[PDB]
């Protein structure tokens, strides 16, 4: 048998944390130490998360009504002796343990989407007096560097950097900022324009060559396209070697195509060929890309087989039956690949997307009500 | 604020050296409240060699409150002089990490990893 001992006072510093298989693998990895880290914005209010170098878990405390004792083996200074009575089902004691902790709760860990804390970071639209406007704000405290941002965000380093690149994060005059859609697209256009004019390798762009190409023949005082702006644009529309960037050309073409949809066929339809003409005409001269209407799936619909018109998902109903109804009213017959991105967000319970469509629609391969 | 989890000590002990972990720890669970005296110091003076209910370990007065007997998955717990509880050794679906939160330096150290627990969820029985 095992002798059970208890201290008169437990240490509440000992706590139970749920270890997911991945968390367990990380913790049980002798190769590296300090791979997991508790992070919080503040001590008294904000949530605490557990982060590796590329993943984030949210902590949740859960109280229970049972007695849970954390006990450890100890070597008695003196032999533990007591008179044995009529104890049956009890063998001779061979071991002593002492309850050193008494927990009333567990700390559960749930995998969660790491996110950036974008509280104090302003939006940059390419103004020339941006430094002044920020300096004349109510909140003087400004996030200086990206390291500070990641440090004070509920996310891992890799998640943070990825999101920062995805949202067009940048820095102007020493203050971190987020480029507006307008300025992002303008900076992209200027970058592409300059890239063609200097015959830069679109598969191997760097910050210095691109920035120099952009600000070569313009005054510094009137040039908002700094090295950081260029680097941001590259980190948004290109992919860097794990050294140099290569443009995501179909993605760029898609962006221009969405803009084109919003500009030319908003509220009105138009032959696909002519729209292709306008779309292509939006690009900087000699820019290498082959456009196709399929790039714009989820951003358009076809009133007729030879016409195209813009549609925003935000204007669609949130109830499945109604959304399918209005989509089918706008267009009687759909191609299978065209309606999916318009209705995917409504699949909350999770199933096969084809079956999901089957519930409200039928094939005949095109799609009908 | 932010701080890394230190698992170096646990790692070293794990590499070196029943349900008891190699580090010599276990988790006991009882569906109820373990009623112990509020004053160990007073009762330790009345403790007779026959009873052996109290002892001193590393400057702490420990009470011997029961006995545990493990038979495979089955487990039996004797509490006090008059209680017997039947329970089981169950494998945790989600392994539990025991961590020590040092408030002084705001440092966290991995103490151990619990994969099993000895649980008693049924009403206590007479000693025989």
């Amino acid at each position: 048998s095992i002798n059970l001992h208890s201290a008169p006072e437990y240490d509440p510093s000992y706590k139970l944390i749920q270890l997911t298989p991945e968390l367990l693998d990380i913790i049980q990895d002798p190769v590296q130490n300090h791979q997991l880290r508790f992070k919080s914005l503040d001590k008294d209010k904000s949530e605490v998360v557990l982060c590796s170098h590329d993943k984030t878990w949210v902590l949740k405390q859960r109280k229970h009504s049972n007695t849970v004792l954390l006990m450890r083996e100890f070597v008695p200074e003196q032999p533990i002796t007591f008179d044995e009575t009529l104890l049956f089902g009890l063998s001779k004691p061979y071991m002593d343990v002492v309850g050193f902790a008494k927990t009333e709760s567990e700390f559960e860990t749930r995998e969660t989407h790491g996110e950036l804390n974008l509280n104090s970071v302003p939006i940059y639209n390419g103004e020339l007096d941006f430094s002044d406007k920020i300096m004349k704000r109510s909140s003087t405290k400004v996030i200086g560097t990206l390291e500070e941002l990641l440090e004070n965000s509920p996310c891992s380093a890799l998640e943070g950097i990825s999101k920062w690149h995805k949202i067009g994060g940048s820095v102007k005059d020493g203050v971190l900022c987020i480029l507006s859609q307008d300025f992002l697209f303008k900076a992209l256009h200027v970058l592409l324009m300059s890239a063609m004019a200097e015959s830069l390798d679109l598969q191997h762009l760097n910050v210095e060559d691109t920035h120099h190409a952009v600000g070569k023949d313009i005054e510094d005082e009137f040039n908002p396209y700094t090295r950081e702006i260029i680097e941001t644009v590259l980190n948004k529309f290109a992919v860097q070697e794990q050294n140099t960037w290569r443009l995501r050309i179909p993605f760029i073409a898609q962006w221009y195509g969405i803009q084109a949809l919003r500009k030319y066929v908003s509220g009105i339809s138009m032959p696909i060929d002519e729209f292709l003409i306008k779309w292509k005409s939006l690009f900087p001269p000699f820019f290498p890309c082959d456009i196709d209407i399929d790039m714009l799936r989820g951003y358009h619909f076809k009133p007729t087989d030879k016409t195209v018109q813009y549609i925003a998902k935000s204007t669609l109903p949130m109830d499945p039956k109604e959304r399918f109804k209005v989509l089918f009213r706008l267009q009687s017959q759909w191609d299978l690949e065209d309606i999916k991105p318009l209705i995917e967000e409504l699949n909350s319970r999770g199933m096969k997307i084809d079956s999901f469509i089957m519930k409200y629609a039928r094939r005949k391969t095109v799609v009908t009500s | 604020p932010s701080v890394d989890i230190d698992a170096s000590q646990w790692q070293k002990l794990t590499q070196s050296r029943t349900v008891i972990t190699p580090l010599g720890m276990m988790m006991l669970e009882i569906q109820g409240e373990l009623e112990l005296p509020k004053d160990f110091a007073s009762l330790a003076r009345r403790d007779s060699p026959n009873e052996g209910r109290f002892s001193e370990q590393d400057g702490e007065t420990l009470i011997r409150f029961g006995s545990l007997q493990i038979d495979g998955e089955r487990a039996t717990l004797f509490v006090g002089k008059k209680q017997r509880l039947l329970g089981k050794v169950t494998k945790l679906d989600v392994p539990m990490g025991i961590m020590h939160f040092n408030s002084k330096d705001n440092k966290v150290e991995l103490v151990d990893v619990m994969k099993y627990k000895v649980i008693f969820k049924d009403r206590p029985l007479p000693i025989m």
Binding site: P12, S13, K15, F38, S40, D42, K43, D44, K45, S46, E47, V48, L59, K60, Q61, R62, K63, H64, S65, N66, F107, E108 | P1, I30, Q31, G32, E33, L34, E35, L36, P37, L43, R46, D47, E51, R53, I63, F65, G66, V79, G80, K81, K82, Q83, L85, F101, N102, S103, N106, V108, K121, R123, P124
Partner: peptide, 27 residues
Amino acid sequence: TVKIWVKYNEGFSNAVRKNVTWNNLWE
């Protein structure tokens, strides 16, 4: 005489999960 025993809880209850702050870990 020393009195040691278990007050049996008829069942088991789990409270609602709660958020965790920095002070919750380091009390």
